[PDB]
Amino acid sequence: RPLVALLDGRDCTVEMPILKDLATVAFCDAQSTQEIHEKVLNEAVGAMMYHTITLTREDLEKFKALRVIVRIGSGYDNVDIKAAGELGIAVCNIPSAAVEETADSTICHILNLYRRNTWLYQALREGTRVQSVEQIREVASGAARIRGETLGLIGFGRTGQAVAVRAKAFGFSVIFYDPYLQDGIERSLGVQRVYTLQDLLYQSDCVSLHCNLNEHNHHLINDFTIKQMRQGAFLVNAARGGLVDEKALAQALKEGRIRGAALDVHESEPFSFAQGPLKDAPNLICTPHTAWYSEQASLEMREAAATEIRRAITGRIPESLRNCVNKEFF
Amino acid sequence: RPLVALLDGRDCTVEMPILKDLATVAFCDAQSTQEIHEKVLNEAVGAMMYHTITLTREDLEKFKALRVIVRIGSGYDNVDIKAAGELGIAVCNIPSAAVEETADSTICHILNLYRRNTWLYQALREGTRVQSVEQIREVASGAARIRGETLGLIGFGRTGQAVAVRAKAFGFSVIFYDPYLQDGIERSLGVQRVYTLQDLLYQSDCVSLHCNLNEHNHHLINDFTIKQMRQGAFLVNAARGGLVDEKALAQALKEGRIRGAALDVHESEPFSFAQGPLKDAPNLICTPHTAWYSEQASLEMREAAATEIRRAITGRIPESLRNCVNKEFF
Ligand SMILES: NC(=O)c1ccc[n+]([C@@H]2O[C@H](COP(=O)([O-])OP(=O)(O)OC[C@H]3O[C@@H](n4cnc5c(N)ncnc54)[C@H](O)[C@@H]3O)[C@@H](O)[C@H]2O)c1
Ligand SMILES: NC(=O)c1ccc[n+]([C@@H]2O[C@H](COP(=O)([O-])OP(=O)(O)OC[C@H]3O[C@@H](n4cnc5c(N)ncnc54)[C@H](O)[C@@H]3O)[C@@H](O)[C@H]2O)c1
């Protein structure tokens, strides 16, 4: 009775009942390929994984029985999907369990930068006494009127579109760059499109990343491209950490070129304020990779990922799969 | 000789040039009526004030020459407007310079409660290491899916309407209670209206205050009315401290009856985390009365307040005044 392994997790309680009758389900709690037990490498027919482990070409070669990998989540940058396909392994994601969570979190980050809600809380926790009106304007200095500001989205897929839909009512003028989209989405949703990243950076008061990390967009925001942003612009990144060169950003924040940054994701996670290139960088908001999370979203995606494995066993791979991201399979 | 005094401020630089040619402008920097210099009491024809000082009946009687009071801001709970009118003193506000600023800040608070952005930032500042996916769920525990939740607005005026316009796109179902509004606003803006406070509290997952503080709504949210709210509801107050009995809220938070509260305003300002009935209360966000502030908003309202004073001198009081809130005048 086929083995299905949950690679980088301990909890397996949603997935077991959905698959009890078809497969033996197990967890590895492996943070790296080295830690995966020999039995799983040899016999596992299916694997489920989060974002905290990476499977390279060499790693995927170590599995002697694997037929399908399912990412519990939308992102699949952490799996070499081209090597997977060449070795006869289908890779799937769960693209839509946490769209709205993520947009909501993104807007929250934007609003926190514009209205300084998080920093004002911090100022009070640090014990600042704000009595007079002059002191209010001092403490809240930089809090800005949103109406008229331009919000620039890099990547206008599921999360990007979701953010756009929320930004309009605050008076943001929304603009996007996505060089892979077909013509027309801009017209449907009544937003403006630009056709180079430079245009987007030149025109945006707040730039937010919503593109998937791929072969061609590592360090999209880098030493060069940051200099193309407006003086005193805002940067928001709830997409993936490798999209941003944190050394570049660090300097930009120190020199005032970027007024502030809000990051849910980082080059090196888990994030710490004591460590890394952003060590002593001012005007930084960070959260620990939570944009996706809600009780309801977590359950939805686990259930969906169990269902996908179920399809892979009962049907034919890759035709039966709902969300297979690698038809350069076989 | 006309004297115009800025009662509770030091900064006078926007107002002087607008009034240079008509009146002498002066500032008191008084935090209480006792601190206002004898000259201002005797000769001041006009006064401008913020929210940090109060004028009672007794206080207003000490002015031997005052004809007009202008609140730089929309709130006028801190001035006995009926006493003012009876003593021949017109009271005006600036009702619309900071509507969108406030709604933006309000939504930011709402989203901070639902997505825990500020508390996750705090958890990172405190040095929490969030490595595994299980640790992400743990630290972000309580982060909730918004779509489907009901947002209940108490007071559906300028700020309330502005929050409703923003909430829709997140999937909130918006409900309101405002017993002074005429029939029909509900229909115009496509939101539902309830006709008692109890019905609003019963049906709301998140309750947000947007009513002006008046004779009849002090401690609107009190020991009795909090018990009418749903188990695990959220409370947001960017309207006025005084609307909420902080002793009652404090116990509610400790007992879990309210899942979290975000307050920009407090019974006793300036707020401190070391002091008051909320001293050791869990799941609290507070900002130090900033919801109104932006560089652009602050300028607009000071300029408007100066222009109102200008009308009072040049024209007949109260007819020439744009936003006079007390026709029980003379
Ligand atoms: N922080 C979180 O918890 C969280 C949650 C969900 C998703 N995400 C991240 O956000 C990403 C986007 O999510 P999604 O479901 O909306 O993806 P999606 O498939 O719906 O959209 C991504 C878009 O990015 C575009 N794109 C790729 N490279 C680009 C580039 N260099 N410049 C501009 N556009 C580019 C693509 O064409 C695509 O339309 C995911 O891949 C994931 O990494 C993060
Ligand atoms: N946080 C801030 O710095 C900030 C900024 C602006 C306004 N405010 C406060 O918000 C309040 C409202 O602002 P606004 O400009 O929208 O005023 P508004 O006059 O346009 O709205 C007030 C509404 O609340 C209603 N209301 C009064 N008493 C009520 C009650 N007891 N129960 C339910 N509804 C009631 C009124 O009928 C009216 O429709 C003011 O008191 C103001 O001080 C705070």
Coordinates of N, CA and C and ligand atoms in Angstrom, one line a residue, chain A residues 51 71 73-77 93-96 98-99 101-103 105-106 153-162 176-182 193 197 200 209-214 216-218 220 237-241 243 264-265 269 287-293 301, chain B residues 136, ligand 1:
Chain A
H51 N 7.5 25.3 1.9 CA 8.5 26.1 1.3 C 9.8 26.1 2.0
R71 N 3.2 20.8 -4.0 CA 3.5 21.9 -3.1 C 2.3 22.4 -2.3
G73 N 0.8 25.0 -1.2 CA 1.1 26.4 -1.4 C 1.2 26.7 -2.9
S74 N 1.2 28.0 -3.3 CA 1.2 28.3 -4.7 C 2.6 28.3 -5.3
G75 N 3.6 28.6 -4.5 CA 5.0 28.9 -5.0 C 5.7 27.6 -5.2
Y76 N 6.5 27.5 -6.2 CA 7.3 26.2 -6.5 C 8.7 26.5 -7.0
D77 N 9.2 27.7 -6.6 CA 10.6 28.1 -6.8 C 11.6 27.2 -6.2
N93 N 1.0 22.4 -7.6 CA 0.9 23.4 -6.6 C -0.6 23.5 -6.2
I94 N -0.9 24.3 -5.1 CA -2.2 24.8 -4.7 C -2.2 26.3 -5.0
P95 N -2.7 26.7 -6.1 CA -2.5 28.1 -6.5 C -3.4 29.1 -5.9
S96 N -4.5 28.7 -5.3 CA -5.6 29.6 -5.0 C -6.2 29.5 -3.6
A98 N -5.0 30.8 -0.8 CA -4.5 31.9 0.1 C -4.3 33.2 -0.7
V99 N -5.0 33.4 -1.8 CA -4.9 34.6 -2.6 C -5.4 35.8 -1.7
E101 N -6.1 36.1 1.5 CA -5.2 36.3 2.7 C -4.0 37.2 2.3
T102 N -3.4 36.9 1.2 CA -2.1 37.5 0.8 C -2.4 39.0 0.4
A103 N -3.5 39.2 -0.3 CA -3.8 40.6 -0.7 C -4.0 41.4 0.5
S105 N -3.1 40.9 3.6 CA -1.8 41.2 4.2 C -1.0 42.2 3.5
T106 N -1.0 42.2 2.2 CA -0.2 43.1 1.4 C -0.8 44.5 1.7
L153 N 2.5 47.6 -9.3 CA 2.6 46.2 -9.1 C 3.4 45.5 -10.1
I154 N 4.4 44.7 -9.6 CA 5.3 43.9 -10.5 C 4.8 42.5 -10.4
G155 N 4.1 42.0 -11.5 CA 3.4 40.8 -11.5 C 1.9 41.1 -11.2
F156 N 1.1 40.7 -12.2 CA -0.3 41.0 -12.1 C -1.1 39.7 -12.4
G157 N -0.8 38.7 -11.5 CA -1.5 37.4 -11.5 C -2.6 37.4 -10.5
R158 N -2.6 36.4 -9.7 CA -3.7 36.2 -8.8 C -3.6 37.1 -7.6
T159 N -2.4 37.3 -7.0 CA -2.3 38.1 -5.8 C -2.3 39.6 -6.3
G160 N -1.6 39.9 -7.4 CA -1.6 41.2 -8.0 C -3.0 41.8 -8.2
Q161 N -3.8 41.0 -9.0 CA -5.1 41.4 -9.3 C -5.9 41.7 -8.0
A162 N -5.7 40.8 -7.0 CA -6.4 40.9 -5.8 C -6.0 42.2 -5.1
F176 N 0.6 48.5 -13.5 CA 1.3 47.2 -13.4 C 2.3 46.9 -14.6
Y177 N 3.3 46.0 -14.3 CA 4.2 45.4 -15.2 C 4.2 43.9 -15.1
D178 N 3.9 43.2 -16.2 CA 3.9 41.8 -16.2 C 4.1 41.4 -17.7
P179 N 5.4 41.0 -18.0 CA 5.7 40.8 -19.4 C 5.3 39.4 -19.9
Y180 N 4.6 38.6 -19.1 CA 4.2 37.3 -19.6 C 2.7 37.3 -19.9
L181 N 1.9 38.3 -19.4 CA 0.5 38.3 -19.5 C 0.1 38.6 -21.0
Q182 N -1.0 38.0 -21.4 CA -1.6 38.4 -22.7 C -2.2 39.8 -22.6
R193 N -1.3 49.7 -17.7 CA -0.2 48.8 -17.8 C 1.0 49.5 -18.4
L197 N 10.0 47.4 -16.8 CA 10.2 47.6 -15.4 C 10.7 49.0 -15.0
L200 N 7.7 51.3 -14.7 CA 7.0 51.0 -13.6 C 7.6 51.7 -12.4
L209 N 5.8 43.8 -5.0 CA 6.1 42.6 -5.8 C 5.0 41.5 -5.6
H210 N 4.6 41.0 -6.8 CA 3.6 39.9 -6.8 C 3.9 38.9 -7.9
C211 N 5.2 38.7 -8.3 CA 5.6 37.8 -9.3 C 6.2 36.6 -8.7
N212 N 6.1 35.5 -9.4 CA 6.7 34.3 -8.9 C 8.2 34.3 -9.2
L213 N 9.0 33.7 -8.3 CA 10.5 33.7 -8.5 C 10.8 32.7 -9.5
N214 N 11.5 33.0 -10.6 CA 11.8 32.1 -11.7 C 13.3 32.3 -12.1
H216 N 14.6 34.0 -14.4 CA 15.0 35.3 -15.0 C 14.8 36.5 -14.2
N217 N 14.2 36.3 -13.0 CA 13.9 37.5 -12.1 C 14.6 37.4 -10.7
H218 N 15.7 36.7 -10.6 CA 16.4 36.7 -9.3 C 17.1 38.1 -9.1
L220 N 15.5 40.9 -9.0 CA 14.8 41.9 -9.9 C 15.1 43.3 -9.4
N237 N 7.3 43.7 -0.3 CA 7.5 42.4 -0.9 C 6.9 41.3 -0.1
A238 N 5.7 40.9 -0.5 CA 5.0 39.7 0.1 C 5.1 38.5 -1.0
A239 N 6.0 38.6 -1.9 CA 6.1 37.5 -2.9 C 7.2 36.5 -2.6
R240 N 8.4 36.8 -2.9 CA 9.5 35.9 -2.5 C 10.8 36.7 -2.3
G241 N 11.6 36.2 -1.3 CA 12.8 37.0 -0.9 C 13.9 37.3 -1.9
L243 N 13.6 37.9 -4.9 CA 13.3 39.0 -5.8 C 14.0 40.3 -5.5
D264 N 7.5 40.6 4.0 CA 7.0 39.3 4.6 C 8.0 38.1 4.2
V265 N 8.9 38.3 3.3 CA 9.7 37.2 2.8 C 11.1 37.7 2.6
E269 N 15.5 32.9 5.1 CA 14.5 32.7 6.2 C 15.0 31.5 7.0
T287 N 7.5 40.8 8.6 CA 6.8 39.7 9.2 C 7.4 38.4 8.8
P288 N 7.2 37.3 9.5 CA 7.9 36.0 9.3 C 7.2 35.1 8.4
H289 N 7.0 35.5 7.1 CA 6.4 34.7 6.1 C 5.0 34.2 6.5
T290 N 4.1 35.2 6.8 CA 2.8 34.8 7.2 C 1.7 35.3 6.3
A291 N 2.0 36.1 5.3 CA 0.9 36.6 4.4 C -0.2 35.6 4.1
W292 N 0.2 34.4 3.8 CA -0.7 33.3 3.4 C -1.6 32.8 4.4
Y293 N -1.2 32.9 5.7 CA -1.8 32.2 6.7 C -3.1 32.7 7.2
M301 N -5.8 24.4 1.9 CA -4.7 24.0 1.0 C -4.1 22.6 1.4
Chain B
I136 N 5.1 29.0 12.1 CA 4.4 30.1 11.4 C 2.9 30.1 11.9
Ligands
LIG1 N1 4.2 35.6 1.2 C1 3.3 34.6 1.1 O1 2.8 33.9 2.2 C2 2.8 34.3 -0.3 C3 1.6 33.6 -0.4 C4 1.2 33.3 -1.7 C5 2.0 33.6 -2.8 N2 3.2 34.2 -2.6 C6 4.2 34.5 -3.6 O2 3.7 35.4 -4.6 C7 3.8 34.8 -5.9 C8 2.7 35.2 -6.7 O3 1.5 34.6 -6.3 P1 0.4 34.3 -7.4 O4 -0.5 33.1 -7.0 O5 -0.4 35.5 -7.6 O6 1.2 33.9 -8.6 P2 0.5 34.0 -10.1 O7 0.8 32.8 -10.9 O8 -1.0 34.1 -10.0 O9 1.1 35.3 -10.7 C9 2.5 35.6 -10.8 C10 2.8 36.6 -11.9 O10 4.1 37.1 -12.0 C11 4.5 37.3 -13.3 N3 5.9 37.5 -13.4 C12 6.9 36.5 -13.4 N4 8.1 37.2 -13.4 C13 7.9 38.5 -13.5 C14 8.8 39.6 -13.6 N5 10.1 39.5 -13.7 N6 8.3 40.8 -13.7 C15 6.9 41.0 -13.7 N7 6.0 39.9 -13.6 C16 6.5 38.7 -13.5 C17 3.8 36.1 -14.0 O11 3.7 36.4 -15.4 C18 2.5 35.9 -13.3 O12 1.4 36.5 -13.9 C19 3.9 33.3 -5.7 O13 4.7 32.6 -6.7 C20 4.5 33.2 -4.3 O14 5.9 33.1 -4.4 C21 3.6 34.5 -1.3

